[PDB]
Swiss-Prot record, chains B, C, E, H:
It comes from Homo sapiens. It is found in: Cytoplasm. Transmembrane segments: none annotated. Autoubiquitinated. Interaction with OTULIN is required to suppress formation of 'Met-1'-linked polyubiquitin chains and prevent subsequent inactivation of the LUBAC complex. Changing Y96A: Abolished interaction with OTULIN. The PUB domain mediates interaction with the PIM motifs of VCP and RNF31, with a strong preference for RNF31. The RanBP2-type zinc fingers mediate the specific interaction with ubiquitin. It is linked to Immunodeficiency 115 with autoinflammation: An autosomal recessive immunologic disorder manifesting in early infancy and characterized by combined immunodeficiency, recurrent bacterial, viral, and fungal infections, as well as autoinflammatory features, including arthritis and dermatitis. Component of the LUBAC complex (linear ubiquitin chain assembly complex) which consists of SHARPIN, RBCK1 and RNF31. LUBAC has a MW of approximately 600 kDa suggesting a heteromultimeric assembly of its subunits. Associates with the TNF-R1 signaling complex (TNF-RSC) in a stimulation-dependent manner. Interacts (via the PUB domain) with OTULIN (via the PIM motif); the interaction is direct. Interacts (via the PUB domain) with VCP (via the PIM motif). Interacts (via the PUB domain) with SPATA2 (via the PIM motif); interaction is direct and bridges RNF31 and CYLD. (Microbial infection) Interacts with S.flexneri E3 ubiquitin-protein ligases IpaH1.4 and IpaH2.5, leading to its ubiquitination. Residues 85-156 form the PUB domain. Changing N99A: Reduced interaction with OTULIN. E3 ubiquitin-protein ligase component of the LUBAC complex which conjugates linear ('Met-1'-linked) polyubiquitin chains to substrates and plays a key role in NF-kappa-B activation and regulation of inflammation. LUBAC conjugates linear polyubiquitin to IKBKG and RIPK1 and is involved in activation of the canonical NF-kappa-B and the JNK signaling pathways. Linear ubiquitination mediated by the LUBAC complex interferes with TNF-induced cell death and thereby prevents inflammation. Belongs to the RBR family. This is E3 ubiquitin-protein ligase RNF31. Expressed in both normal and transformed breast epithelial cell lines. The chain holds residues 1 to 179 of 1072 of the full protein.
Length: 188, 193, 193, 188, 193, 188, 188, 193
């Protein structure tokens, strides 16, 4: 689309450029409209990529999220982990809203949605840290006092990766994922 | 493929053993936020009734507005009458609140004059009317009227939205009483003490 | 200077001794009407929770949809799993409903084919899935699939809105169960009988 | 406005033409947007008129509504009667909506809003009759079976007169009505 | 990656040796179509000037409206005056046209009464005023006024848009004359014969 | 409307308060939407006022505009003067636009619309001065270099008075003005 | 998207179903908004398909359009043929507009855009025939008198195929087409 | 009851003996302003043709863009071809301009890289392509590409709108040439010198 007019050519790395450009395109679309839904076809460059997990998820520790939460059958762990990711995706999008939630600056561990979704997976809390919720309280997790606003680029990057990971996990539950062994790439 | 988990609901602390209260407070913020998005936002009965029908104490429902005093001290004659007198005041007080949230505030938003004819006949017709203006930010009292502090450039959006919501809720309550359709059989008595 | 008295609330009969039920039914119509105004209308948790949190019997909450059967007969393994399996089906069933309310219906709206890959893996994955399609109007069964009667030019808007609302409510319920935030501690058990 | 370009001249009846034209203008504005609010200045030709009550309210039996419900002080009767009129105005506007209420065809006497507002005044039920709710049941009042739609001109006329009467009653409670003895014109 | 080739421009026949005329006629249809899309559409000077600045004969520019007669027969006194008198009439005649294109026509759109005070003082103040109404469809003459044929359910959209456009163009012309900014030095004379 | 909730009461000056409040209301409506049209009924408090010309036009020297340009019959002078006012009203409204004309800072005497409309009346140039075009060049008239923006309240006040004066002059041409001798009030 | 919920499964023909479903999806999107632009990623199922030309273009005689107009180098013929297709695409879209061009019923051979674009390629006229312009005049080509409206499904099918063919021809000029020898598939 | 007198037309100096030029310049500003209001604004043939059909010299029509050089220096082979090659470049150059007017600029708007694949194949395919980027503000040349000055926080809206308009006009011209519908019989030759 647009970002493609500005990203540097990458001779001999055409598949990686295509990835990097798409990522940036969708990051910008989230910043323009945080409530926006993306189609499978819009995500395709990011889903079909042969690139390794370490290079597709730059912020999000996807390896530790799946490996540390593969309890029982894939059908079990997968449902739990995508319920957490769904909630996490909302935390990210909400931070890019033109009118953020009044109490956007803090998440509380005792919060009823949080306690049973995000906090049901190891690595969940870390993801909020990636959004900017970097300060520890006994009560929960918060943005630094002096930070007046979210880093919208950081938020969009993480939000995109969260939604991407969830999408991947959904196509596996469907038995519909492009990469033939995408679970084995994530689990080992 | 999304979970049903609200929006403000994600940030408000848990309140174990107080789930109806928490649900009320979260619904309350969403309506306050909606007024901040659009100062002219109208709310339907179905959006307000779940807030009004909760069994909570009055002190739990009305955090800024002193609803007890507004009802009790103006309970002159029959409810058929003073509820209308009060509704009229509350109605005008809501406009004062919404106007402060408007993208283009009234030129003269900084002050309210006691000899203003609408104010005189509606809001100043009831005890507590001035206090509500105070809650919006009209805290500096001249003999001429009430005004915002000279130094303060803007109203406090959150505070104003809050007070405006509560003004609106209570007027809804009085209005349901007038229609004998308030969901709580004892709603008036609770307001009188 | 208006009274707070709803809209559909003005036409529904009184129900003395059944005020919570009546309030639920009125809130239910408004959401159904909203889907008819806009087939893509999203509803917030605060709009749906007051419908879900009522103590009413299941037969009082679900007038068209057979929610008991949908939950009970597909309760295979652990709720963590079959609630997701059911949610996935309900989600797709909601799209079928909304699509029938769309100002431009899918070209092929008149029929659903059993070998359709989305249908096969989602809706046909659960008992009761076909019955729901039947409720939308897909009442004529070929061996190929289900379809609307040849003679019938349009879907029944009210019926479709109704069923789509209920499909949506139940999926909200399952979703609140998955999040351990359903307002009723016994909500699952009620659905299982 | 617009209707003024079409209404016939009325030599020697300039004040009555002005009334008739305004009425029609506002009737049309209700038909275009049934949820629309009118300002005191928009209603002025209809409020300031010296014309007699019989000629300002053509459908609405305003005389019988005020005279039959003047219980106690004006402050009392006036509040009750304007609460009824407020509800009646909603019944009218709702019938001119682009998506009418599902059960628009019938009003039920046991309806909780109806029972304590409209049915609190003698003449209340008649007003619904003027909207088209002409068929009697023990249960309530209904549009004839064969009538597929409201008469939008009849509905707008009555809706306007209802709102006009209520507005008048409001300016008296305010002690703000243009005609010096508008209550005496209505009560005798 | 699209070619710049207009829209109505794709359907109008070629006119070799008459390219400026054809371009005028195509621009004319687009503005007529725009009035049909939105009866309140305002047009800027830049949209109208290219139509007015063409060297075409008057009979080539005004296909329905008899602009010659409107200017010539009402040329009483000085242009400073009668151009205003004419503009006032044309202005009202444009409202009559636009109103017939409105999604909700004036209740009384079917007839115009000669004793109507606006009509009397504006449109009936000039020769040709009635003829223009005739062009819109008010073809049946009573002694009371002019009206559409009883049988005819709707105005002719295309005809009305056409006439309304021309009424508008000419009033633009008179207005440019009043401002000494008409692009043609001889524009008045052309209208007088 | 809204401004009425804030303007001070004026015991014994009810007709002047009504004027002052309406003026302010319409000034604000111009600032919200500079392209907005006003109805005769919206202008009525400002047209029907018995208040003297000196108190109805506070910025605009209406006396000098009409008296100095009454050439020939009223029909003549009136048409010329309302053509000037129409153009002047555009200069005012344009300054309250959310995207002002690129060259809003300067008006040029040789400008073709200006030369034959505004500059056809004595007092025309002064009106632009009232909008903020206070600096003299041989070429035209300009806003001071250091002034980054129009005084939107000054602009709205003058714009309103311009439109009001033009409206008055239009109702006289119509023989339709509320005050029986409004021309004599303006001309002497 | 939506149409995918209704199209019949096609065991052993997954690549053809994917094509057929996408086609129908985009046909519907054209019918909803005839002025709408499609992205390369939206067209991908239709561009990347290994399916034969005869099965990708069902109405549009793509074979005869390219083979009969390969004059000179590909760079030449390709530019000419995509200029024709661009114009043809407008004729199709215009027929699906909510307010069709006034003279939509007829195309004239002497029309200046037509004469030098569409009529510059053999097969051009046939494409209009596919839109419904089936009746021959010496003057041009027209819809049958009795046909009150376009067949919006026929129009959308042809419009889509036109835009698809043009898109293909554009990616060849770019040297960017997915199929390695897409010109050889079209030319022989 | 308004006069037809434009908007930008009220501020531009008079130009006696140069009325067609002045009218062109005023129409030009309005389209530039329209791009500033909405960076995605599409313009119809009828809005652009009156600018293109004027007899003015090329130096009078193209104030920023060096249209002569763009056409002349890339006139390789036949117009059927190089006009397409040029149109493709101009098309991409217009996106670069509009993107700088967007309410949310591309994250990487500050720089254009010469090895960028779209740039390489389209804009860098023609002499003058880089100069146009320079006109938008990409004035600092690295070996990597072109970029805005580090210090400059925003593009120059007016300049960018101007250049983008001209890029658009010329591409319209080339497009009319390709369709043999340019209003001036000699339009190509004028561009070649």
């Amino acid at each position: 689309g647009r970002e493609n007019l500005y990203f540097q050519g990458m001779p001999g790395e055409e598949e990686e450029r295509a990835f990097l450009v798409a990522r940036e395109e969708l990051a910008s679309a989230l910043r323009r409209d945080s409530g926006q839904a993306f189609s499978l076809e819009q995500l395709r460059p990011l889903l079909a990529s042969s690139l390794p997990l370490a290079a597709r998820y730059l912020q999000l520790d996807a390896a530790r999220l799946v490996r540390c939460n593969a309890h029982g059958e894939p059908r079990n762990y997968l449902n739990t982990l995508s319920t957490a990711l769904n909630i996490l995706e909302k935390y990210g999008r909400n931070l890019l809203s033109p009118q953020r939630p009044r109490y956007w600056r803090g998440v509380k561990f005792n919060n009823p949605v949080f306690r049973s979704t995000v906090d049901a997976v190891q690595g969940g809390r870390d993801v909020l840290r990636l959004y900017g919720y970097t300060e520890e309280q006994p009560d929960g997790l918060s943005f630094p006092e002096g930070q007046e606003e979210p880093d919208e680029h950081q938020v969009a990057t993480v939000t995109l990766e969260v939604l991407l990971l969830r999408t991947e996990l959904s196509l596996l539950l469907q038995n519909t994922h492009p990469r033939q062994q995408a679970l084995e790439q994530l689990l080992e």
